[PDB]
Amino acid sequence: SKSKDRKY
Amino acid sequence: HGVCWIYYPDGGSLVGEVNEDGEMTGEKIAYVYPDERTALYGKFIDGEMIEGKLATLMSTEEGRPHFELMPGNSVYHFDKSTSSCISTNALLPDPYESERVYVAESLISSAGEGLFSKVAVGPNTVMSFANGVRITHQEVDSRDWALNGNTLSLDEETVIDVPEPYNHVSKYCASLGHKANHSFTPNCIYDMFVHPRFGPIKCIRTLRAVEADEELTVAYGYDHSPGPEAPEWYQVELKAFQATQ
Ligand SMILES: Nc1ncnc2c1ncn2[C@@H]1O[C@H](CSCC[C@H](N)C(=O)O)[C@@H](O)[C@H]1O
Ligand SMILES: [Co+2]
Ligand SMILES: [Co+2]
Ligand SMILES: [Co+2]
């Protein structure tokens, strides 16, 4: 994703 | 005749005499920030802030908080962002954040402005709030990195963004967490936060003690192997970081 701090 | 305190996991709380349904509804309800001293005190309906005035929690007696109102006519209300509106008072700063952080030129080369501590604090201290408009992962992912400099995932459905021109402090300073720069050796982390004005957002929380005027940084946490799906400045920094390792 092109956003910070995503839970992968 | 009793007083109830309801703590969120982030350490903020609602406090007051609840009504017969057990709800936080009244003219003397308060939200108390995680310092257990800064408060927004006034009219709430079922825990939603209708009119909270800035106050200090001076003491507690038998569990009951005793507040002193701060001077000025500083009032706040629940004002959760939408996909297109960031705040009904974009230039009205959060009073807790304003005592703890300020924005200046970053110490990181070529990184623009950054977020700095105003005072020395201990570990685990909430310093700043990351509020923004609320958009979908589909919108963000389907578009250019040039437009994604400020996007922060909130959960599996929502991304928080601070779009132009709100990335300038002269146009938006209600919250300042979008001003923290990236570091692979950060002094802070993003954490969930339930804010009485902003609603469900994230905050910047320290991992360790920080001194006054120290730059606050967080790990942006882009996916490193979806190479990395990330801006080039980060990809460069990742390689350097991996090298020193
Ligand atoms: N470690 C780093 N190195 C270089 N640029 C960085 C960085 N961390 C953040 N940035 C910059 O900051 C942006 C994210 S928002 C962070 C605040 C920004 N510096 C500002 O002045 O408003 C990124 O798009 C990038 O331009
Ligand atoms: Co107003
Ligand atoms: Co400006
Ligand atoms: Co780049």
DSSP structure string for B132-184: -EEE-HHHHHTS-GGG-SS-EE-SSS-EEE--TTTTSTTT--S--GGGPEE-S
CA–CA dist B27, B46 (Å, integer): 12
Tell me if B235 CB under 6 Å of ligand 1.
Answer: no
Residue B74 CA to its chain's centroid (Å): 19
Tokens describing residue B125: 């201290």
Q: What angle do CA B206, B210, B215 make, to 5 degrees?
A: 85
Strand locations in chain B (E): 4-7, 13-16, 26-32, 38-45, 48-61, 64-69, 75-76, 101-105, 113-117, 126-130, 133-135, 152-153, 159-161, 181-182, 188-195, 199-206, 215-218
CB of B40 within 8 Å of any CB in chain A? no
What resolution, expressed in A, was reported for this entry? 1.7
Interface contact flag, A3 B153, Cβ < 8 Å: yes
CA–CA dist B116, B105 (Å, integer): 9
Amino acid identity, position B168:
H
Name which residue sits closest to atom 24 of ligand 1, judged by CA: B149
Interface contact flag, A1 B141, Cβ < 8 Å: yes
Kindly list the structural domains of chain B, giving each domain's residue range(s) and its CATH number in brackets, ordered by start. 1-78 (2.20.110.10), 79-221 (2.170.270.10)
When computed from its CA atoms, the radius of gyration of chain A, rounded to whole angstroms, is: 5
Pick from B66, B70, B34: which is nearest to B52 by CA? B70
Residue B12 CA to its chain's centroid (Å): 12
Picking from B156, B218, B229, the nearest residue to A2 by CB comes out as B229
Question: Which residues in chain A are closer than 8 Å to B145, comparing Cβ atoms?
Answer: 2
User: Helical H runs in B20-125?
Assistant: 95-98
CA–CA dist B2, B64 (Å, integer): 8
CA of B53 to the centre of ligand 1 (A): 34
